Amino acid sequence: LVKKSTFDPKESSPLVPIPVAPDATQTQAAVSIFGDPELPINPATGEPVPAD
Amino acid sequence: VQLEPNITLVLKHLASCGAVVSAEQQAALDHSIPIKRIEAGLRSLTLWGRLTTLNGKDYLVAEGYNVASSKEGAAVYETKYFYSQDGARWSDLQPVDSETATRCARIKGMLSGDPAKNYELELVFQIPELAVLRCRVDAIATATSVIPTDSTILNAASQVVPNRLFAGAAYPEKLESYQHRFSLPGSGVTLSQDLRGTWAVQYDAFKGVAQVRSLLFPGYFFYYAANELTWGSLYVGDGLRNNDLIFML
Amino acid sequence: HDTAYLKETVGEALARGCAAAISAQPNDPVEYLGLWLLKYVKNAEVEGNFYRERQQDLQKK
Amino acid sequence: DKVPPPAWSPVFASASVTTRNQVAGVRSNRWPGAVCACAGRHFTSMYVGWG
Amino acid sequence: GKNKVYPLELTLEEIFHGCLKKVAHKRKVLLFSGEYVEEERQLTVDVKPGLPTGTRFVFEGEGNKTPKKEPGPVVFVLKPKPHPRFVRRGSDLVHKVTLPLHHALIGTTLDIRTLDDRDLKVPISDIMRPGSSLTVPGEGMPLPATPSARGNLVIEIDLLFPTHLTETQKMLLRSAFFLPPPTEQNEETKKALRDYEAAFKHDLKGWATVFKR
Amino acid sequence: GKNKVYPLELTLEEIFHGCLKKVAHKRKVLLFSGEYVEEERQLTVDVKPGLPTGTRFVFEGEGNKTPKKEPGPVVFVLKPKPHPRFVRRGSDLVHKVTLPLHHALIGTTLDIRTLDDRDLKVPISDIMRPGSSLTVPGEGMPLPATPSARGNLVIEIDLLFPTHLTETQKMLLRSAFFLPPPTEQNEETKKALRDYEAAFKHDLKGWATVFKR
């Protein structure tokens, strides 16, 4: 009952919240070896970028 | 006593039932499950199953919930579903409105590979294949999603949370020991309250591993090890339903 | 007269709210007081509802 | 669909098509659970599942 | 009778989450001296999540005070700063994406970064028409009435067609746009398609996988 | 000072060529009788080639005749009847053709029958963008000022994307949309392309040309 009855004036915090998340560069690099990386497109001309 | 089912123990205990994944896809899963779990802000994300297509490119499907609350006598989980042709990159499965959710249950046969396929039904209605896949996953989750009883408890503010003091289920052979996920902890609803012959349980007393297979949906398996309290489930195979249950049994 | 109307109408609840505002020291005590009164009536009604639900569950068991 | 599904859908072992030593086989649609695989000169058939 | 209006600029993240802004006001008390006297007043404005554009916050009692007439209220009108990705419409969000042609036809995933710190990857469900839109439910701005519901994000698809195509590329496109249905193909057609696919996905001499340069 | 305004509906062919219309007017003269008496006058209106829509022809001295006031003029306002093909936009026509996607990419020739009794075949000169257009100079309505020059016909293109595509068709489309430049192709690539082209254009078992059932 007390838990249900406690007042909780949720007010607008001055700051936008920030995420607490570990860095993900190493795992992303590890993932980047699976599958084929599709050739990126050139925004100027929809034809794909030169490749080897 | 566990808080989330492992992806390795599930694949190990369900390997015999044919619920297996390719080794390359298994490594890709091991790498890219946390990436999607952090990219989506989900506290829980596990592999839900694997659906077969007319190509070799099966759909791997993973579900994840952020909040899970009691609502009108139903333990509602706010699940999000993701699909992937390969274990590397995941896409989202948007929910389906009721009109197409009823026009998608009449489309049968095992799906194709490209998720950009339009089925045409009867004037002609065009329905995307992703909608059909979402319908099938929803139907299987409604019919099958199974956890041991008393493994969840209700706290203040009416949220279902894992029971940290779950000591395990006596008589794992009995179907009474298992319940659907969306059953409230207080209610005594189990798989016994389903149809009589739609669930087969085979329990190895020595190794202490019970195995529950769905006969209404033949490709759903759920293992529960009791020596160390570990339960998991996987659906492998096409998502179609077994209508004529009376004749088979 | 008017003082009695105010007292036996709102006095106890307003005193409780003012005590809460003194204890909490918010940045805008008047809005705090208004939200406190709204939550006051809401928590009374949901308190009654909570007792009703517990009784129903016990009877069902 | 108005196109009847064919039996024996393919099955691959890698997402990339440029892997070096990969196995690749067929899987039956009439009988779900029967699979044939072949790596070089080592081939095999096997059926697991409901009958 | 006269009120001083002032634009209040916010970012979409603040309106999505709900800011508590502090604003400075220059109030001019007018007296017998030729120069007026100015003072800086601080005002706290509480913008709640999902307040619609054009919202007016009126502070009564503040404003330039002439000797005889009590100053009229000051008005703050909400307006959002331009965002690099989203433009808000009504209650939901519009994201305009330039999409290549093959991403439309074959189908790919659009990767968008929400106002909240989540990364959506939305698949292309079918052949996206010119001027078509893809709607993701429960991803727009929150509803001001209820602080839990959300609008539906709208992705307006803009197609980016290729600038050049060779005659052999056009031949391949023509053959792809008139292939007989699979229950009407010859055996020669099936063998030819098998050969072409095995020669297009060749691990060393095939061009399915190319590394950029 | 009241006037009677009447629509005058013309077809695009008449305005293009220059019609000569005879219109009927029911004019009322007020008398001592309780009811009026009316008569039908005939009016010759001469529309010149390509007069702008909204042109007013005013006949002075024609209109209902009250006992005291000389009747005011009667106004005819020129408006065009809907056309199955063209809609005029100022001095030039607009034709809205729905185009298949492969006609857009590969390129075909649109067929248009002009207002004059001449047919017209206009090639698609490049990859037609979504919401793009084409212009054929000297194929619009005549200029009202000079009776020789005309506007320019404007084709507004609305692509008709295919409704269904198979997975092998998508494979062919991806191979077409990522083919390496012809100076980067291996010999295996060229041999495979030659084989596929010889198989797709096979005179008896190829699907390059089929007859509709």
3-state secondary structure string, F76-89? Answer: EEEEECCCCCEEEE
Across the interface, whether the CB atoms of A5 and C47 are under 8 A apart is answered: yes
Round to whole Å and give the CA distance between B108 and C51: 50
> Residues 6 or more apart from F200 whose CB is under 8 A from it?
E171, E175, E192, F206, F207, F208
Write the burial class of residue B86 (CB in 10 Å: 0-12 exposed, 13-18 middle, 19+ buried).
buried
In this complex, is the C-beta atom of A34 within 8 Å of any C-beta atom belonging to chain D? Answer: yes
DSSP conformational letter for F213: -
Cβ B172 vs Cβ B166: under 8 Å: no
Round to whole Å and give the CA distance between B183 and B73: 8
Round to whole Å and give the CA distance between F13 and F116: 8
Round to whole Å and give the CA distance between C43 and D22: 66
CB nearest to A7's CB, from C27, C36, C50: C36
From B110, B113, B238, select the one nearest D49 (Cα to Cα). Answer: B238
> Which residues are bridge partners to B74 per DSSP?
B71
| Residue A46 Cα to chain centre, angstroms | 26
Contacts of B41 in chain E (CB under 8 A): 116-118
Nearest CA in chain E to F99: E130
**Phi and psi for C44 in degrees, rounded to 5?**
-60, -50
Cβ E164 vs Cβ A47: under 8 Å: yes
From B145, B165, B177, select the one nearest B74 (Cα to Cα). Answer: B145
From B193, B191, B226, select the one nearest B209 (Cα to Cα). Answer: B226
> Residues 6 or more apart from F194 whose CB is under 8 A from it?
none
Round to whole Å and give the CA distance between E128 and E117: 27
**Phi and psi for D28 in degrees, rounded to 5?**
-85, 140
C-alpha torsion angle, residues E192, E196, E202, E208 (rounded to 10): -150
Structure tokens at B147: 């956890």
- Give the DSSP H/E element, type plus range, for residue D45: strand D42-47
From A45, A34, D18, select the one nearest F129 (Cα to Cα). Answer: A45
Chain E neighbors (3+ CB pairs < 8 Å)? A, B, D, F
Mark which residues 46-105 of E lie under 8 Å from A by CB: 46-48, 98, 100-101
SS3 C22: helix
Round to whole Å and give the CA distance between C19 and C40: 14
**Phi and psi for F71 in degrees, rounded to 5?**
-60, 145
> Residues 6 or more apart from E184 whose CB is under 8 A from it?
none
In chain A, DSSP finds a helix count (H) and a strand count (E) of: 2, 0
At CA E184, angle to CA E170 and CA E127, rounded to 5? Answer: 50
Structure tokens at F163: 């409704």
In angstroms, the separation between the Cα of residue F163 and the nearest Cα of chain B is 8
The 3-state secondary structure of chain E, one letter per residue: CCCEEEEEEECHHHHHHCCEEEEEEEEEECCCCCCCEEEEEEEEEECCCCCCCCCEEEECCCCCECCCCCCCCEEEEEEECCCCCEEEECCEEEEEEEEEHHHHHHHCEEEEECCCCCEEEEECCCCCCCCCEEEECCCCCECCCCCCCECCEEEEEEEECCCCCCHHHHHHHHHHCCCCCCCCCCHHHHHHHHHHHHHHCCCCCCCCCCCEC
- Give the DSSP H/E element, type plus range, for residue F198: helix F187-200
Mark which residues 15-44 of A lie under 8 Å from E by CB: 16-17, 19, 36, 39-41, 43
| Residue F96 Cα to chain centre, angstroms | 6
Round to whole Å and give the CA distance between B48 and B134: 13
The position carrying tokens 């566990």 is B2
Structure tokens at F194: 């030659």
Helix axes C2-24, C29-60, angle to 10 degrees: 90
> Which residues are bridge partners to F95 per DSSP?
F86, F155
Q: How many residues does chain A have?
A: 52
Neighbours of E48 (CB within 10 A): 15
Round to whole Å and give the CA distance between B75 and B149: 13
SS3 B185: coil
Cβ F112 vs Cβ F161: under 8 Å: no
Mark which residues 6-35 of D lie under 8 Å from B by CB: 6, 9-15, 27, 29, 32-33
CB nearest to A14's CB, from E20, E162, E212: E20
Resolution for this PDB entry, in angstroms: 3.2
Q: How many CA atoms lie within 13 A of F66 on its CB side?
A: 8
Round to whole Å and give the CA distance between F211 and F213: 6
Structure tokens at E148: 């839990």
Cβ E65 vs Cβ E30: under 8 Å: yes
Round to whole Å and give the CA distance between B184 and A46: 54
Round to whole Å and give the CA distance between E74 and E51: 19
